[PDB]
Symmetry: D2
Subunit: 208 residues, 4 copies
Amino acid sequence: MKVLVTGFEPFGGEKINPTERIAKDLDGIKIGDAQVFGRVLPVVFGKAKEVLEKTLEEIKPDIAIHVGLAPGRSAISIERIAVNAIDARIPDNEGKKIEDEPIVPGAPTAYFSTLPIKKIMKKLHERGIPAYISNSAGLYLSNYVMYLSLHHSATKGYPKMSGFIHVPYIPEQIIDKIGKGQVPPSMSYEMDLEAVKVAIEVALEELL
Amino acid sequence: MKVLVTGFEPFGGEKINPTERIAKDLDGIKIGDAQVFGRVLPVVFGKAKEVLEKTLEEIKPDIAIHVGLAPGRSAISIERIAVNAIDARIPDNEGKKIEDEPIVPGAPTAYFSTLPIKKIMKKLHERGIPAYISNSAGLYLSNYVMYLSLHHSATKGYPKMSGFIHVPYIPEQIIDKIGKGQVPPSMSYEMDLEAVKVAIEVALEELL
Amino acid sequence: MKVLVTGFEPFGGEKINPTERIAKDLDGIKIGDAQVFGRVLPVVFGKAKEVLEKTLEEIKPDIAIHVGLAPGRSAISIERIAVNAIDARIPDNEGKKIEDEPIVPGAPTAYFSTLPIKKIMKKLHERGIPAYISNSAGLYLSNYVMYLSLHHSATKGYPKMSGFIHVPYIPEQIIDKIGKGQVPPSMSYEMDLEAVKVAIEVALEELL
Amino acid sequence: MKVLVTGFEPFGGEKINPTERIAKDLDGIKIGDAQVFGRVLPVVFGKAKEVLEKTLEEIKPDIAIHVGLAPGRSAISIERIAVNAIDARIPDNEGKKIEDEPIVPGAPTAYFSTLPIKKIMKKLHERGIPAYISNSAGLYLSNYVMYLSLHHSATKGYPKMSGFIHVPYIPEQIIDKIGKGQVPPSMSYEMDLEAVKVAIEVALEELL
């Protein structure tokens, strides 16, 4: 049993992206006899697809849990759906701002996450971790990778389960925001890491 | 050198108030040779004044740091001013909803906190703790105690420094909020506790 | 050329739903030689489908613009996608709270709105009307009708264009909210009405 | 009976300030036999004080209602208190960003508005105008003028009543905000103007 967890590099002017550390912290660990692989993806259209595809083909995980930062969100959010569209509010790390363009021409308009999202949310709550189901992962890189992963599952047969989890800013990222005229919500890195571990465990238990 | 830290009991239907635990956790500890006393106050007009007055007279602290819960706030907030007014949006724990009434008839319309609020905010930031200066502690029990404490200082000569710190909901308090149609910001109890300890240390260093 | 505009009846305890008036105000009007029909839909699962289906079959509009109230939103929002799922945060007007259930079993996971959403947004901006593209119409009745309308288009060939527009609370709906501990954003009814008229005109110009 | 209404010039990069038009629109009008004077103030520390002082001495109004723009607020807000402090989050129109400095050294820490704020709020509600009581007018120019006006009343005996009213962005100011990654609340200029007229009428009726 193999699990792939991905995170993203910093973007949008931020010095850090907490999901990058999550991926690195979880890489190489084992939950039961399941092997976990952690990989960081670039916040760049096209290149992110190349890396994701190569990683999926290399590892061939049974479960894929893609993690990303969601500025402004106040709790852990589990994405219910991936949409076949790109409409960036901001450009990617290479200055590309793609608007109204499909991710995969001719492919389904959307894919539902195949992770047991409701069970994951329930377990997180039991652990005192606020979490909810998000109905839009945006139309930037998070949705981009979420869709491609689910499409890979639908066309290649693996991973069996795929989904996306967004985390809020971590406290240290809020400091420079103060004075700039706003105080966005934040959540500790420790809670985020535990949340992802819980998601993996629940997904695994689901696959038996 | 003596420091008094207060917290509040649960109110507004909440099962817990994180500041109650903060007070209990800090009671009896020492920062350097300074003795810290932690006391919990009732969320009841009148009675809260009795308890506060008695506590202040009993301990005669050099520094008083009153802590409270601020539902909806996203980071640690240090109150800049206490206002001589009561206008409760909700009733206190005994069903009393006082509207447009002074706290102390004839006393000053307001008192500025005497804690080194800017230095405290700066130190918190250096510790990676998001914090900002609040210009209104509301007109409920937090402001009530903040004003009475500062008034005590002005009329009795002690405590030398007095102020108020509000903390966001802690994560576990958000669980039942989910589904109710909203996900308020939250901050870990551990961060809150450390923030209060930092405030105490900075206040002490200020008094020398 | 025929255009169908729908609105919803009051729900969630609200005395009014501004979209109900929008539908009635636009019913019978003409934009050029295009005939506009305005109909009000019940905020009830099942029944809403019956009414929508019957209305679509009766009128056979070339363009369908469904309007609804989005409590909390601050500006006009044009829905980009309809999702094949029902997961009500609150029950409908008949007390039914459907959770994790498809709208049409076996049908596509989602449909993109076929209204020229970007052009509509642009024209609204030129008119000084704040508007943006929403990537989730929720999973309540608004999404329910949006999906069914787009599904009707895909399977029956009409309407040629279908989409959904959400409007904020109108000012009068905020009054009772004040004191309840919150002041949600609002937008004038007049602006909402004009926004819908603009959307219709742009959609029509698109069909030529 | 004379009434002075003030507004502010554009600031913070905005092309307009709706309160500037409010002042000009109300200048010269009469409510009953009361004469209303409308004046625009610069968003500049020091200079704003000069203009305010000169205006107050020139007109010697019985009632002074200062109006300002509050970016982000969703409804009309009536300020309850003015604070003797300056701590600008942004610089004024001349690049001056004053931090932790009193407005009037030695003067009271704060002054309560002498306008019948609760009655004004009630009348606005009866007119279908969402409005609430604000407990902080910020520590920028709005608070600056509010405090100086109330201080003038306390030391000079006039105006008899003084207060501050903040209005949200008007819709047209939101357009350029869209895409920038946020849609702030807004309220029509017409509603703002009526709200100020209502405040004046209620204040006048209070003075008899």
